[PDB]
């Protein structure tokens, strides 16, 4: 019998309710996607291994 205050701190959050703020405006969008943080990798191998 979990309460509604344990759900708000343990249970994960769903995607279907979000607000977007473009600059100083609030525009209601339908689907925002494609934001990420990517890096490339540098390898260096030498001789003895």
């Amino acid at each position: 019998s979990t309460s509604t205050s344990q759900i708000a701190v343990e249970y994960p959050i769903p995607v279907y309710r979000f607000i977007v703020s473009v600059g100083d405006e609030k525009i209601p969008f339908n689907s925002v996607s494609g934001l990420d943080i990517s890096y490339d990798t540098i390898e260096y191998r030498d001789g003895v291994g």
Partner: protein, 148 residues
């Protein structure tokens, strides 16, 4: 008739009329070219057709590379001549092979002087066989057999 393929071959060496049957495994062999040098002589009022005069024949240079293996009588020959000990000649017999491992044609390369010897480079970043690009200059070539 029908042509032949170029991935069956063996090359055996003759060190002072003593054959060398340990060293027949090679990656590639350069293919044997010879060329008749030609001096063009243009003359007189004949300015509508050329006139070519023959000269001496210029034989090619035989390169052949192999993976680096255990030391052999081939390798002791190149190391002896390229360390300044002894300038010696070695005869090379390069032959094509059939399906039944019979020779089609063979090229005998008399008095071939070992000129240069070059290994591939080490590199940690790529996976490949160390090869021995070793190149030797012959002074005559006598083709022998069928299917040249």
């Amino acid at each position: 008739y029908t042509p032949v393929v170029s991935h069956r071959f063996m090359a055996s060496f003759i060190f002072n009329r003593i054959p060398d049957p340990l060293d027949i495994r090679f990656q590639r062999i350069s293919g044997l070219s010879r060329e008749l040098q030609v001096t063009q002589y243009s003359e007189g009022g004949e300015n509508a057709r050329n006139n070519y005069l023959a000269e001496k024949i210029q034989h090619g240079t035989l390169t052949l590379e192999r993976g680096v293996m255990t030391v052999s009588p081939l390798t002791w020959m190149f190391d002896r001549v390229l360390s300044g000990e002894k300038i010696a000649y070695a005869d090379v017999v390069v032959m094509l092979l059939n399906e039944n491992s019979l020779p089609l044609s063979s090229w005998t390369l008399s008095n071939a002087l070992p000129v240069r010897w070059q290994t591939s480079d080490f590199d940690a970043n790529s996976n490949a066989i160390l090869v021995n690009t070793l190149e030797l200059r012959y002074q005559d070539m006598r083709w022998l057999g069928v299917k040249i």
